[PDB]
Design a protein around this ligand. Structure first.
Ligand code: KYB
Ligand code: KYB
Lengths: 342, 342
């Protein structure tokens, strides 16, 4: 299938084992901003669901399919590849919805549905939006979408902005500096210090922060899920030009995302911005191994390049320069091994 | 190989990726009790090393091989299957020991050594001693051991004791009772509550505790690494009869372990007992889903059965009874998915 061809079996097994736990479904359901905003998007756009056919891509416990049923959907196909599919079926029976929600075990790339659908719903967003490569399964599912069918969420906006955080930078350097020791119990570790620095600075930092660390207005990159094809997400090139509002050391770029559910009645936004209430996605920071000085009024420009790998994640390349001085930082990050600093 | 036949590829890939990070090698090296006790065991038994041939099974960064070199070993074969082997080779060159330490990339079950060795050194202990199934690779390596060669560690003792901890027990039902809601955003979750309770109680609890929670003197199960075969670890049956020193509710069994390095000059012990300073192994507790009342002077008897699985861990079965009342509890746990409560 398209899933098995893009994914190492090793990563798939670990991935679906992780989402098979009730504890993990619970952790996600308990994010009230997430769960409540999804419910509001669906119920306030009830005409997008009333008497319609729905596909729920990666239904987990089934929660979004239940929201679609509350809104009046005639039929909901709820596709789930983990062992969570069994638990979903139990809930569908106990809530007396066997006439309306049909659980289909397996990958959305591999199952068959009996008809085309009016609307696809999913929660495909990972850290930095793109982690887990679930957006590809979501877009793949458009093969089941009727012409003029909708998608919930409809669009996704990635936001980036430069930040200053000397304490964060020093924490990572202090950890890597372990490998500087010429006599760790009599052993010289120092030939590995560069490799250690590289490894620590490859880790995106998942945590929240005060907005005052941000040194310019964010730049926005938009993915339209109605129009994008799966293959568009193999290589994601995000150019940026920041106009610096404060003078200081730029220690890296901070990332967050918003999704919009563009319904017939209204548009509802789920935001993971640092100006908004906290979610279990937090925000994500990519540190530069050498920070860059910029004065207010300068321009920081470059590219964030995300390259999809077979471990259901991305190799990230970030190149940034201060245009007025030619000072450059080039960084590689490994989105599969984040540092959960919260 | 013997490794591939006993291990799902999915688990092996995750396992060796994890040990490929310098951060993880560092976390283990920074455990002073571990690193210092290994150094002391090797250096204070310098006659077991001076001019001898040594095999280091799963050398990681190479630290134990360097200790063998400090003690005078003539030749050390350092086997490592993760990408950490490359980092070890860099350290061997930078410490001018290429004439004495030979790094061999790969699994100890698949590589070739050019000669037999006098002594095998390793750190094969996981949570509850047996987690990760690395003891099997350690014993497998005895095919390279000269007759009357030594093993460092020489023996391993698993200790188990009944404990009382009402707050730990209650935390499981508090977490699972999330599912005992008739209208979580309009959805009746209650039919999954039993399954959630079962999942939480299947997790061994990795943390430490005050010794006052223990209700009887521990029972000891010993593996002699000079005599044991790999096959001995596929099924580990630990019978127990505890003579209760305190009255109360028994909520489960607590586990820890000791290893001894039995050298020609002295015996050195590395202990993870709750009476000793804390290590990164902590201790491990397996809860009973139904606790058992026992009075001081009663006998709590039964069996702990550890059954090796292909995810490099064990299925644990614990059956216990209070002999004076016939009250019974039977419990199943999955050592691959522990709860890190510290
Ligand atoms: N917090 C962080 N870090 N990230 C955010 C979590 C992102 C959503 C989690 N969950 C959403 C449940 C929403 N109700 C994804 C589910 O989608 C299933 N699934 C994944 N892929 C496929 C596929 N190709 N086919 C069929 N099912 C698939 C998984 O098994 C899993 O249950
Ligand atoms: N903290 C917690 N929780 N546990 C502690 C766990 C203790 C082990 C740490 N480390 C020892 C560090 C250096 N003394 C094990 C190494 O042995 C490698 N390795 C495993 N198996 C094999 C094999 N079959 N062949 C070849 N190499 C193998 C691993 O890649 C890993 O580097």
């Amino acid at each position: 299938s398209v899933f098995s061809e893009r994914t190492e079996e090793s990563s798939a097994v670990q991935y679906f084992q992780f989402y098979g736990y009730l504890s993990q479904q619970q952790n996600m359901m308990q994010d009230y901003v997430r769960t409540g905003t999804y419910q509001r998007a669906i119920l306030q756009n009830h005409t997008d669901f009333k008497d319609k056919i729905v596909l729920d891509v990666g239904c987990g416990s089934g929660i979004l399919s239940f929201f679609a049923a509350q809104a009046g959907a005639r039929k909901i196909y709820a596709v789930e590849a983990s062992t969570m599919a069994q638990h979903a079926e139990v809930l569908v029976k106990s809530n007396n919805l066997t006439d309306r929600i049909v659980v289909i075990p397996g990958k959305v790339e591999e199952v068959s549905l009996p008809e085309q659908v009016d609307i696809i719903i999913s929660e495909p967003m990972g850290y930095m939006l793109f982690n887990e490569r679930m957006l590809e399964s979501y877009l793949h599912a458009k093969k089941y979408l009727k012409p003029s069918g909708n998608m919930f969420p409809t669009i996704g906006d990635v936001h980036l902005a430069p930040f200053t955080d000397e304490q964060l930078y020093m924490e990572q350097f202090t950890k890597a500096n372990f490998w500087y020791q010429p006599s760790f119990h009599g052993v010289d570790l120092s030939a590995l210090r560069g490799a250690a620095v590289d490894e620590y600075f490859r880790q995106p930092v998942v945590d929240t922060f005060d907005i005052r660390i941000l040194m310019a207005k964010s730049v926005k990159y938009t993915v339209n899920f109605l129009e994008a094809k799966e293959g568009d997400l193999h290589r994601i090139e995000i150019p940026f030009k920041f106009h610096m509002l404060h003078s200081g050391l730029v220690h890296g770029l901070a990332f967050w995302f918003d999704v919009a559910f563009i319904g017939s009645i209204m548009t509802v936004w789920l935001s993971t911005a640092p100006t908004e209430p906290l979610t279990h996605w937090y925000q994500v920071r990519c540190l530069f191994q050498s920070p860059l000085f910029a004065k207010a009024g300068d321009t920081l420009s470059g590219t964030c390049l995300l390259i999809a790998n077979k471990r259901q994640s991305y190799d990230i390349s970030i190149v940034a320069q201060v245009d007025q001085t030619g000072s450059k930082s080039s960084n590689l990050l490994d989105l599969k091994n984040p540092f959960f600093r919260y």
